[PDB]
Amino acid sequence: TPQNITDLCAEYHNTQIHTLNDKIFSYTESLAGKREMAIITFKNGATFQVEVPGSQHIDSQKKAIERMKDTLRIAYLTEAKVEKLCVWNNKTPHAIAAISMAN
Amino acid sequence: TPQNITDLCAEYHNTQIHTLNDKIFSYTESLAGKREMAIITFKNGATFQVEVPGSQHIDSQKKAIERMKDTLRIAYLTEAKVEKLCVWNNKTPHAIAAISMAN
Amino acid sequence: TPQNITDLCAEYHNTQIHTLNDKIFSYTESLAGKREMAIITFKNGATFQVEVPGSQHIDSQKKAIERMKDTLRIAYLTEAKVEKLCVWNNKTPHAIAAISMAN
Amino acid sequence: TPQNITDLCAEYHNTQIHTLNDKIFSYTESLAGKREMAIITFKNGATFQVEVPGSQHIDSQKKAIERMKDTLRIAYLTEAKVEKLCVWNNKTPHAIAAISMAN
Amino acid sequence: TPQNITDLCAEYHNTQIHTLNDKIFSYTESLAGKREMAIITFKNGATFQVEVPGSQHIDSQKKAIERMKDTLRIAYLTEAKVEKLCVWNNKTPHAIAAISMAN
Numbered sequence A, B, C, D, E: 001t002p003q004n005i006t007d008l009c010a011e012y013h014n015t016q017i018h019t020l021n022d023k024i025f026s027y028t029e030s031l032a033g034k035r036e037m038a039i040i041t042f043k044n045g046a047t048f049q050v051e052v053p054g055s056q057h058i059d060s061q062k063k064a065i066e067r068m069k070d071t072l073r074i075a076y077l078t079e080a081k082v083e084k085l086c087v088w089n090n091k092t093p094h095a096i097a098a099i100s101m102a103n
């Protein structure tokens, strides 16, 4: 298994690391049909989503998607610094695959 | 694909944005049958609900409804500023579709 | 839908509003068989339960009963002021139907 | 229903009340197979478990066992004073049936 | 049942205790397919994983794996001192079986 988010990210196509080293500026979530998603931004203007669960996702990802939205919410509310995001870059906004928090 | 709550809200019929830029004044939740819901207010008098799950809701919204009530409760307890709500305005109280939190 | 806990409470038989405007003094929870419940008290001694799930509850209430116990626990730990409880008064301790929190 | 943890405890065989009036000293949790459990200690050395789910448990206890482990973790992290534990004393460590928290 | 993490750890093949007595330095989690995992590090450079659920796990471990990730996140965010980890040291990074927190 990978030892860090960068090596994990590199195991997948259509991904990249964004380095933030900053707390989340805004947290948005929706229960509207077909847009059951979260959106976060940073004060540098960067915007990211947790995608709506879809047919691209495998069964094991369903709980992890829910966990990620839990993580983003509590990160936002505690002003935790986000180090990096691994995202898929074939979606707009870029879609979160992984998060690291440090410092 | 929307990048913010206003753009997401605009995808639906019978919605509008309310801008609060304030913490939640009160949080109410009920387990009574057929009224399994939450109600929030703001000091300006505005009142909003998370609707009881109904047949209007598609299957994917049910999990998101539960998440929204989790979000409103922890927002209330942490005195987090709510930036905007996207609501359906064909319900009273207006029914929450999405929330953004920012300072 | 109800605008507030008082109007909600009025929709049900065997209920009353208790106005506390105080934090929870004690929180008790049990996993013992046939007593899977929570009990709260306020400083003055007034005691309330979240009932064990039973035949009187409809299925939609089950997730809400779990949510209420989550709410009481976090309210207790954060010393959140409880405004009102809507309770069924045909049970001892009186059984919580809804809670409102306001500072 | 019982008004308090002491009266609840007395409804069961093989139980006793421990009166701690103290925060949890240590919190341990395990995902190892057949030891999916939590263990807590107090400064006085007293040690308690939340048992692995087993044949002695009834269905209604399953969610309550999971809730108890949630409660112990957050109690530990917030340094919440535990008033009493109701435990089964036919197990070692004594097995938690109920917890009360009060200032 | 075991009374502490060291005795619990010793019930299993291919494990060891690490004594950290330190807060978690970084927390990483992933929803990427087949890497639905968490990774933590400590300032001394030690790295640990919560393994992706797989065929080596029995059903009862699944909820406990999810719990462990919840615990590591909140331990990280609260800067809780981790006393010990029980890990399987036949994986890289070492895979967490249990955690103790004290002091």
Ligand SMILES: NCCCN1CCN(CCCNC(=O)c2cc(O[C@@H]3O[C@H](CO)[C@H](O)[C@H](O)[C@H]3O)cc([N+](=O)[O-])c2)CC1
Residues within 6 Å of the ligand: A032, A033, A034, B011, B012, B014, B051, B056, B057, B058, B061, B088, B090, B091, B095
């Ligand atoms: N990637 C796809 C994105 C594109 N979008 C565009 C918007 N589309 C909206 C479809 C989701 N459906 C509804 O929203 C909806 C809500 C409805 O009631 C509202 O339901 C609301 C709750 O959902 C609320 O109760 C309100 O008061 C009722 O009037 C009713 C119906 N309906 O009768 O079909 C549908 C989906 C496809």
Ligand SMILES: NCCCN1CCN(CCCNC(=O)c2cc(O[C@@H]3O[C@H](CO)[C@H](O)[C@H](O)[C@H]3O)cc([N+](=O)[O-])c2)CC1
Residues within 6 Å of the ligand: B032, B033, B034, B035, C011, C012, C014, C051, C056, C057, C058, C061, C088, C090, C091, C095
């Ligand atoms: N869609 C429109 C929404 C509007 N709603 C508003 C409220 N109305 C609620 C009806 C749900 N039913 C009950 O609540 C209920 C509770 C009951 O027991 C109480 O159950 C209580 C727990 O629910 C408690 O245990 C108490 O002690 C028992 O006596 C009994 C019965 N009953 O015998 O019919 C009903 C329906 C319409």
Ligand SMILES: NCCCN1CCN(CCCNC(=O)c2cc(O[C@@H]3O[C@H](CO)[C@H](O)[C@H](O)[C@H]3O)cc([N+](=O)[O-])c2)CC1
Residues within 6 Å of the ligand: C032, C033, C034, C035, D011, D012, D014, D051, D056, D057, D058, D061, D088, D090, D091, D095
């Ligand atoms: N609706 C009215 C409510 C009133 N209640 C009050 C309490 N009464 C409780 C009955 C539930 N049963 C048990 O508890 C129980 C636990 C048991 O094992 C303990 O199981 C315990 C865990 O549950 C623990 O592991 C312990 O070490 C074992 O010996 C065994 C048995 N049994 O062999 O019958 C029963 C029923 C009536």
Ligand SMILES: NCCCN1CCN(CCCNC(=O)c2cc(O[C@H]3O[C@H](CO)[C@H](O)[C@H](O)[C@H]3O)cc([N+](=O)[O-])c2)CC1
Residues within 6 Å of the ligand: D031, D032, D033, D034, D035, E011, E012, E013, E014, E051, E056, E057, E058, E061, E088, E090, E091, E095
């Ligand atoms: N009531 C007493 C409880 C204690 N006792 C412990 C030992 N078991 C033995 C039967 C299990 N057989 C295994 O072979 C086994 C291998 C395991 O290692 C692997 O699975 C692990 C995850 O579970 C790791 O992935 C590890 O790397 C991998 O090698 C883990 C476990 N387990 O239960 O967590 C079991 C009997 C019960």
Ligand SMILES: NCCCN1CCN(CCCNC(=O)c2cc(O[C@H]3O[C@H](CO)[C@H](O)[C@H](O)[C@H]3O)cc([N+](=O)[O-])c2)CC1
Residues within 6 Å of the ligand: A011, A012, A013, A014, A051, A056, A057, A058, A061, A088, A090, A091, A095, E031, E032, E033, E034, E035
């Ligand atoms: N085992 C260690 C990792 C190795 N890894 C790479 C090789 N795959 C092979 C089979 C998976 N095939 C995919 O094609 C695939 C596409 C993905 O991208 C899409 O799904 C993503 C969400 O999962 C995004 O929506 C994205 O936009 C969309 O393009 C994502 C994943 N995934 O697992 O998260 C898999 C197995 C896994």
